[PDB]
Amino acid sequence: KKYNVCIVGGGSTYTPGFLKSFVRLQNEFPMEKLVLFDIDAERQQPIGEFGKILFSERFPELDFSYTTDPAEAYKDMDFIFMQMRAGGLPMRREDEHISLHLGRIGQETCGAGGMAYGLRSCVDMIESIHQIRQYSPNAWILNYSNPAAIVAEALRREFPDDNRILNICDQPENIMRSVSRLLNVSWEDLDPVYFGLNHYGWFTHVYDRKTGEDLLPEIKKIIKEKGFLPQDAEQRDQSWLDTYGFVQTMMEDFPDFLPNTYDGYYLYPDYKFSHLNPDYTRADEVIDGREKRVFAECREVIARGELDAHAEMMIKVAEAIAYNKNTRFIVIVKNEGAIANMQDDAMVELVCELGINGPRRMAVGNIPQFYLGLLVQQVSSEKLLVDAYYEHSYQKALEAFTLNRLINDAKKAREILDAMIEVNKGMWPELK
Numbered sequence: 001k002k003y004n005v006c007i008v009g010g011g012s013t014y015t016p017g018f019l020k021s022f023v024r025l026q027n028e029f030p031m032e033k034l035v036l037f038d039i040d041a042e043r044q045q046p047i048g049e050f051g052k053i054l055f056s057e058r059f060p061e062l063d064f065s066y067t068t069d070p071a072e073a074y075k076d077m078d079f080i081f082m083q084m085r086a087g088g089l090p091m092r093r094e095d096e097h098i099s100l101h102l103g104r105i106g107q108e109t110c111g112a113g114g115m116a117y118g119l120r121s122c123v124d125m126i127e128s129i130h131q132i133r134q135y136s137p138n139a140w141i142l143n144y145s146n147p148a149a150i151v152a153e154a155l156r157r158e159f160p161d162d163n164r165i166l167n168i169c170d171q172p173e174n175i176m177r178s179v180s181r182l183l184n185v186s187w188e189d190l191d192p193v194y195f196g197l198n199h200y201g202w203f204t205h206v207y208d209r210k211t212g213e214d215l216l217p218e219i220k221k222i223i224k225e226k227g228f229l230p231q232d233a234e235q236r237d238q239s240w241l242d243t244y245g246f247v248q249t250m251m252e253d254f255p256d257f258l259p260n261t262y263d264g265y266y267l268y269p270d271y272k273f274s275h276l277n278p279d280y281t282r283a284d285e286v287i288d289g290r291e292k293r294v295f296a297e298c299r300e301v302i303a304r305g306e307l308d309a310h311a312e313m314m315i316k317v318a319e320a321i322a323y324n325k326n327t328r329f330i331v332i333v334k335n336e337g338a339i340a341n342m343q344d345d346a347m348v349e350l351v352c353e354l355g356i357n358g359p360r361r362m363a364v365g366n367i368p369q370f371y372l373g374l375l376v377q378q379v380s381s382e383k384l385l386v387d388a389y390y391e392h393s394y395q396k397a398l399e400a401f402t403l404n405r406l407i408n409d410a411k412k413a414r415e416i417l418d419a420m421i422e423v424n425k426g427m428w429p430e431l432k
């Protein structure tokens with residue numbers, strides 16, 4: 001048996017990493033057809049022409065194509081890999097610049113910039129899934145598209161009976177990968193216990209696979225004396241090294257659990273804002289860094305005619321689904337008791353077994369009071385935001401902005417929200 005796969009967002013900077021991963025895991029994940037879909041034909045073209053060269057060299061049998069036609073992309077598909085960026089990096093720049101220029105953190109998925117990106121994603125994600133369901137109702141939809149917490153909440157309401165949609169994030173695994181470098185072990189030999197929302201969580205235990213010993217006490221010891229580095233620290237930009245290195249401070253103020261690196265924004269908004277350049281942001285770093293290198297690569301290959309971890313995890317998720325492996329991943333799922341003292345309809349992030357029938361979440365119980373206050377505040381802000389999407393309510397958006405920890409003020413919320421409405425004119429829902 002071989003599988004038909006479609007990548008939504010074929011013009012993404014991560015797509016070449018997917019095409020090379022499909023070649024490497026060719027024996028683990030047998031494919032018969034691959035289609036790159038995108039709404040930007042010119043941005044997707046050099047990536048698709050690079051793939052034709054690559055596939056000819058290393059995957060001749062595979063039938064590869066790139067298109068901007070939904071019918072060609074979504075017909076008779078087994079898996080849909082979604083990695084769109086609603087508004088693209090130019091709008092990510094506006095998310096970061098305007099927030100920082102107005103005295104709050106500007107970030108891709110957290111704060112005012114994340115909720116602005118969330119409103120754009122709600123519109124485009126719901127529109128895209130409806131198209132997909134028009135052609136292949138039973139295809140497994142694996143979504144990377146951000147902001148994941150907001151997208152999952154909106155998709156929960158729009159498709160309540162759809163059981164083949166899974167939102168995932170690679171941050172929990174990247175922390176496990178960083179821990180494996182800390183401990184000089186294979187990251188596949190770590191068994192975590194994790195709870196929280198997307199980009200807002202903590203590891204309560206880090207067990208060794210073979211022996212079951214809690215490695216978390218030793219993890220904090222090496223962090224205090226040596227620090228915390230990403231597993232690919234040699235290739236990472238300086239901003240990522242600072243984000244990972246900041247966990248040393250976080251673990252000294254809050255020593256119980258190993259934190260998701262995104263916790264630093266919510267626990268240290270003053271420090272994080274103080275060290276962010278308002279005129280040269282992370283979106284500019286990506287434009288000058290990853291976007292430039294990847295597109296230049298591809299154009300080098302097209303001109304000549306001849307010729308990782310992020311793309312591999314989604315493929316491994318597809319493998320666990322297609323072959324009913326029931327292996328453990330940290331994915332986003334509906335709560336309904338898994339976190340016992342939070343509401344049923346919250347989209348939370350937990351360890352789950354993954355098979356043909358979807359994620360099988362494991363109960364965590366009642367979380368401590370300190371973390372309950374943090375997560376309920378955030379999940380309420382997210383649910384109020386998609387409330388504004390469904391109700392066309394400016395008032396719901398204002399309450400979502402005010403409640404959020406990275407804004408925290410009603411007058412600042414209205415000031416930022418009004419600025420966001422103007423630049424997001426044709427990409428947001430109406431807010432009246």
Ligand SMILES: NC(=O)c1ccc[n+]([C@@H]2O[C@H](COP(=O)([O-])OP(=O)(O)OC[C@H]3O[C@@H](n4cnc5c(N)ncnc54)[C@H](O)[C@@H]3O)[C@@H](O)[C@H]2O)c1
Binds near residue numbers: 014037039085310
């Ligand atoms: N969940 C995670 O942990 C995780 C990790 C890494 C990246 N991501 C996400 O992957 C995405 C790719 O990021 P990037 O830096 O490559 O962005 P990018 O701008 O390079 O790629 C986005 C692509 O999606 C396309 N697109 C935009 N709107 C679309 C729509 N409505 N329909 C179809 N295609 C559309 C664009 O044409 C563009 O080619 C981002 O959304 C990012 O948040 C998620």
Ligand SMILES: O=P(O)(O)OC[C@H]1O[C@H](O)[C@H](O)[C@@H](O)[C@@H]1O
Binds near residue numbers: 146
């Ligand atoms: O800032 P970038 O290099 O685009 O990467 C940002 C990405 O990194 C993190 O690991 C998160 O898992 C993603 O959700 C986020 O989008």
Ligand SMILES: [Mn+2]
Binds near residue numbers: 168
């Ligand atoms: Mn993520």
